[PDB]
RNA sequence: CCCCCCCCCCCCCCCCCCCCCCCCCCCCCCCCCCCCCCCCCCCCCCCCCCCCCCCCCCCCCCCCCCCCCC
RNA sequence: CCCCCCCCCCCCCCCCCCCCCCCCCCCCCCCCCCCCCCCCCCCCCCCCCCCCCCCCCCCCCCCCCCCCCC
């Protein structure tokens, strides 16, 4: 029977990758600092001092946000995440200590952290800039409120909201989503961009881009922190904003699956073409694979999971071209920089999707009605 | 088959969030006072003294109501709630002690509580104001009744009724439901607003708004206290009022689901439009998700649960516009400040819902009858 | 039942027009000459003399061709045709006689016809021109053949072939099909355009246009002559050419019916639009009417039959626009000067018909396959 | 319903042509000789004298064969045929008479016919040539047999066999089938081409071509004579040869119908193409029309019947191209000078028909087997 | 990003039952005859036949993926 | 009372055909036998029986219809 001349390549590749009986273990290189719940207050203080500092220097904001996320997770869970990701990690204990230095010819008390990645001078200078900006702004408006201070419990979570936007745009492969990050961080968080002098979305976004590029394990740590944070029973409104912006990253890098479901929903006719119907077997194969994967598959491209390539639909040029055409016809493709590889099917689907709005729907009374 | 080109994104996101294998643990900052059953009588006395004090100062009423709720729960359950919500809490023991001070040049006996959040001066001044207001009102009417006193066992529960109204309106994101809270606290509790001189709904509502804004864990504590209180076998009539006002908050922030069920019930025709039928698959997805969640989902938006965004229907502009139009046509939309994002479907549904009252119903004898 | 809210207007109009119990009888004005079988040879001689005359004057060729057709029909059938068409006719007997005149100072014998419409001078001058052209061409090539002479039995039928082309293009309402007539008379009849010096398609076509414009009863006579000629058991090859060119006129003025059948055959999707399906009832009404009429309906527009307007499809703007779009997309519309009255449906159908050639066909596996 | 958007143009045209209520009547011009059964022996004698005359002059053989056919039919049936064909005929009586002339200075008795088309000198000279050729051949071989004489009763029927071959090739429109006529008259009738000195196929074929070109009514007369001859109960072997060669002309000019039936029989796949299936409705229309016509339709193109154009299949370019391709692939198209108007379908069908011989047949186990 | 409206609940009437009535009552041990069963003939098998025998390595192309908005 | 609007229609391209091909061809009479058919016994019926039988007139009331608008 010709019906059994078939090969389930996607499922077989998945079974090969999921049934490996040997494991690799990478070496991060530089030692990882693992803060615990103890220093969460101090890291939040540092984030607040960065936020209240106008004309601020955000060169180290990405690392400080990563430290805050790791302190929220806790040392045990951070270590367990790093092992489960397949890393050899030098767990570095983080504890708070005092440092005494004379600036302006006056003895001064600073409370800093033992971070191998972040030197004492940097934290001291962050405090100095924050203090003098606070002095100037207190002079210019008289009395402060808990709104204008580093002691707010959500100062770190605003920085992590910026990180969540960066994560949403990470799947583009470079810093091309920086403009989108800035635009969305101006739409969202506009009250904060009033309230905090140093909340500069572009600088923080660039810092997080840099830290994610240099340390790929921080992407894994941040994704699992975002999943753990989104699994809480509740929280403040800033944590709700972070959860909403983080789940905006679900399915990033897999827009074609959603647009294919959309093209099925609007019932585009060019799904009835000969070549599309030729590829439909493996297309349904891919969709069933995505469903069997389920929730974990939504962050494959952000995490650079090796099995991300199994979810691709560009390996079916005709179906992909029809899907892109339908997306462009419905007016939702935007600046999507993926290009069709069957221009004719793309144009036909685009035209039909455009007439799907002036000419509402097409019946199929043809053929017996 | 084109029927298997589908993705269950809502369910996959829920499974991802519910199957997390790492947890975060937040730090509240300031220490939490955890009163036990021992001081419930004293906290109720404090609430009664606040209530019988005319021209009262309600700056601290929200914290005192929170303390009363936590004392009703007990220290064990309050601590367990705070852990289950994912908080690091400094459990502060609350016990009663005496303080002696000379006011009016006379030695005076006061019995106060060891609360870190509430200083002794504040409790002393509350007692002073209550005592002199009691003296003045006793002078002006001769003899008091158990109706006019702080020893009533429901004085704290009236304050918690005001808190329940504030909770009902918390999902609006700000203090825009203050007018509704005042109106409902005048409709309900009018006998009390006679009986208690200091029962000022606006001041207590503002105090509870402030305490819920500053301490997001108090929202969790109060919601679980309200659920535990509503699980009792019975109580007084004020506790019944509190239970009725608290379950008025169930489903807050999710009005569109109820209005969609309503639009299905009145059988609005614009549910048969092309785009609405395109979105119906994911709409049924969302409704099945809400049902699988069940009872716990009714307080997701009040608690700022991260999975609250999964219940949204505004991600389907056509269905949402039809639902808003049907609600506006039936005359129940009120001042709902959500706006349609398909004006045409909104207007069509509104018009049909309006003719659903003069022109009772429409048969579908068209097509074969 | 809403299914019986229907009116069969086309069929009712046809029954009203076909069941009239009173008749009109028009008056042609000028007397009609009715030649019989006797003078068929002489009229064919006259046509041959016109054909062999180079640089000829074809002012009277249309009338002579009409006389030849009427002589082929016979006087009885010509009279019966004129009565059945509803005309009052002065039947004029045509017989041959001799006329003697002196040209070049020499007595000369001419044999002419008693035609009221055609004077003796005209026939004499036709003979003179033919004779001297024959003399010149005999001088220039030495000896003639039966190919180069007026005695050929098909000289009149060539002129009637030109008349048949003019009839094919008569439905345009004016002399706009003259170029098409000339082009087709050059493609066909090229051997004759060699063989006959005076076979000028444009002059003969203009003469036939003039005679059909002045005498509308000659259109009826010629159409019924063409039907009678095409009902013969056989004939020469020129008669076969005439029959082929005459049946090319069948269905002239009713191209939209054929193009609608074509759009049904290529299964254009825009036949499934809402408005097209609204009009489909009356469209099927018109097609059933055309079929009930049958063969006689193919010459309604040429004859200016009053019931020609009942076969129109432009009374359904959406279906007509779809049909024109399908015709233009398939590349067969040419210079058809009818214009769509629904531009959107026209463009949509044109686009789909164009993709019907690169993208062969579209299956309807959508909806359950 | 879209299924009733249809027009039966072929059948409607046939009904229009078959239901004409007026008739034309052509004039042959020159008078028709109508021999009766009386002079059949003399006309057969003339044909035999032409046949036994070596190096003969066949300028008049076509007319003599026509006279023999008309004498076999009889005067009554010849006249009735000419009327039924729609001709005005001057019936000329043919009778035998004697003419006396002195050749070689000697009185000589000749018995000739009163034929207006054939002068006495021609018959006399035919007899002279036959007599002297007979004398020379009798001298050269001594004694004659009934094989070598003009008195054989089939001498006229051999000439009519040559006429039958010419009729088979008449549908080509010119004298392009002359080579085929000569080849078939050499294959058949080779014993006669031994036996008769003047049986020159090319000269007789040219004479019959000429007479059929000049007198189109002789084609009708000969076709009906051949039908009447083929309706006899029996005859000689030469009459059987004539019947076989005459029914070889049945269906001449309609090869595409037979080749389409053939392409259906060999089950060519390109009959499943989209455009072919578009045209299949009108193709089946044409085939049903041909079957309804039946036997009379086999001589439409030979007789130049006006309804011959209704049997054409070239009005369906795709089906015609597939049919020509299948014919060329099977190796039976020969020098058929009709050309495809869809080269692609022609080539595809030709290729499949070629692989129909090395690769016997193709099953359709594809799709469920 | 999400969200945004309105809304305490309840309210009536109401005991139920009520009579009459013990049940049973007759007749009737069961069985009973005749009959042992079996009975013949018959070892089974018997031939022919080892099996195998050809041809044949397989492979060979192209291809990172992603990119929108929220 | 009813009615009340708008609206001529048409418009393109296109003669058709074209090849090959006589048919047939062998063998063959059929039949063949046997056979008359029938054959017996037998009349049928047979009794009893007239049928019917009573009671019974039927009916009984009320009630014109209609009414608007168009």
Residue numbers in the entry:
A (entry chain D), B (entry chain A), C (entry chain E), D (entry chain H): 2 to 370
What do the study authors state?
HRSV belongs to the Mononegavirales order with the non-segmented negative-strand RNA genome fully coated by the viral nucleoprotein N. The resulting helical nucleocapsid (NC) shields the viral genetic material from recognition by the innate immune system while serving as template for replication and transcription by the viral RNA polymerase complex, thereby constituting a potential drug target. The helical NC, together with the RNA polymerase L, its phosphoprotein cofactor P and the transcription factor M2-1, form the HRSV RNA synthesis complex that constitues the minimal infectious unit of the virus. We explore the polymorphism of the nucleocapsid-like assemblies, report five structures of the full-length particles and two alternative arrangements formed by a C-terminally truncated nucleoprotein mutant, and demonstrate the functional importance of the identified longitudinal interfaces.
In spite of the truncation, the N1-370 mutant retained its interaction with P and therefore the corresponding N-RNA assemblies could be purified following the same protocol as the one used for the full-length (FL) construct and analysed by cryo-EM. The most glaring differences with the cryo-EM images of the full-length (FL) N-RNA were the appearance of two new types of coexisting filaments—the herringbone-like helices and a major population of unforeseen rigid stacks of rings. The ensuing 2.8 Å resolution cryo-EM map shows that the NTD-NTD stacked units are indistinguishable from the N10 double rings of FL N until the end of the α-helix 344–358 and the beginning of the CTD-arm. In the rings and helical assemblies of the FL N, the CTD-arm of the subunit Ni protrudes straight onto the top of the CTD of Ni+1. However, in the stacked rings of the N1-370 mutant, the truncated CTD-arm sharply pivots away and, instead of engaging into a lateral interaction, tucks into an identical site but on a CTD of the opposite ring in the stack. The pivoting of all CDT-arms tightly locks the adjacent rings together through their CTDs, such as to generate a polymer built of layers of inversely oriented N10 rings engaged both in NTD-NTD and CTD-CTD contacts; the latter are additionally stabilised by binding between CTD-arms of two opposing protomers, in particular through a Y365-Y365 stacking.
